Amino acid sequence: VNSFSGYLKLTDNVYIKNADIVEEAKKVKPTVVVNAANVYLKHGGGVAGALNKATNNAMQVESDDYIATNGPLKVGGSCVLSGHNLAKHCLHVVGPNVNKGEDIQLLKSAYENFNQHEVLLAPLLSAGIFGADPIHSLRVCVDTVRTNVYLAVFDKNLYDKLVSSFLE
Ligand SMILES: CC(C)[C@H](Nc1ncnc2[nH]c(C(=O)NC3CN(C)C3)cc12)c1ccc2c(c1)S(=O)(=O)CCC2
Numbered sequence: 110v111n112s113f114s115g116y117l118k119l120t121d122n123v124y125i126k127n128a129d130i131v132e133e134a135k136k137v138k139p140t141v142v143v144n145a146a147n148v149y150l151k152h153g154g155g156v157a158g159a160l161n162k163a164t165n166n167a168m169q170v171e172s173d174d175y176i177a178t179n180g181p182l183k184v185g186g187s188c189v190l191s192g193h194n195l196a197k198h199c200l201h202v203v204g205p206n207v208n209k210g211e212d213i214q215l216l217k218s219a220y221e222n223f224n225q226h227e228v229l230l231a232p233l234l235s236a237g238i239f240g241a242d243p244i245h246s247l248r249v250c251v252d253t254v255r256t257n258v259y260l261a262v263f264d265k266n267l268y269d270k271l272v273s274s275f276l277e
Pocket residue numbers: 128129130131145154155156157159232233234235236237238239261262263264267
């Protein structure tokens with residue numbers, strides 16, 4: 110149904126909210142929820158772990174079956190799989206992990222995958238333990254994505270810092 114509410118409008122197509130992506134998926138019922146995935150689709154912690162746990166492990170079982178036949182994804186790449194009880198589809202997107210030496214330039218490619226979907230619920234790519242500068246990831250999102258993206262950032266201090274820096 111894509112019933113997003115309580116979001117700050119950053120541009121004509123980019124919205125942001127201090128919220129848990131899992132709780133947003135449950136209320137909004139989006140056509141697409143984006144997962145901050147790794148190349149082998151192992152959803153053990155962070156955003157991936159929260160989405161997988163909200164599907165009672167159905168996402169991980171489906172992901173293991175995909176990996177068995179198709180092998181790993183590439184950094185900057187993506188894969189559409191079922192969204193289970195959280196969405197119609199889950200778009201698993203691999204952003205670069207700069208804390209593991211991955212190229213930050215690939216973050217533009219990661220966001221480009223959002224342009225295949227009219228409207229998406231998404232986390233801020235490569236933030237958290239992936240180590241990218243969150244203000245830079247927001248700028249790559251604004252500059253790259255043309256479709257409607259609703260960003261859920263589950264940290265009030267980070268949300269306030271991003272909004273303040275964007276309004277400069
Ligand atoms: C920046 C940070 C605040 C953000 N985290 C989140 N952003 C939006 N929704 C979220 N729900 C939960 C959660 O733990 N949800 C569970 C509580 N439980 C009730 C459900 C966390 C989270 C974030 C964004 C991107 C990435 C990461 C973290 S990561 O996982 O460290 C590496 C991958 C890239």
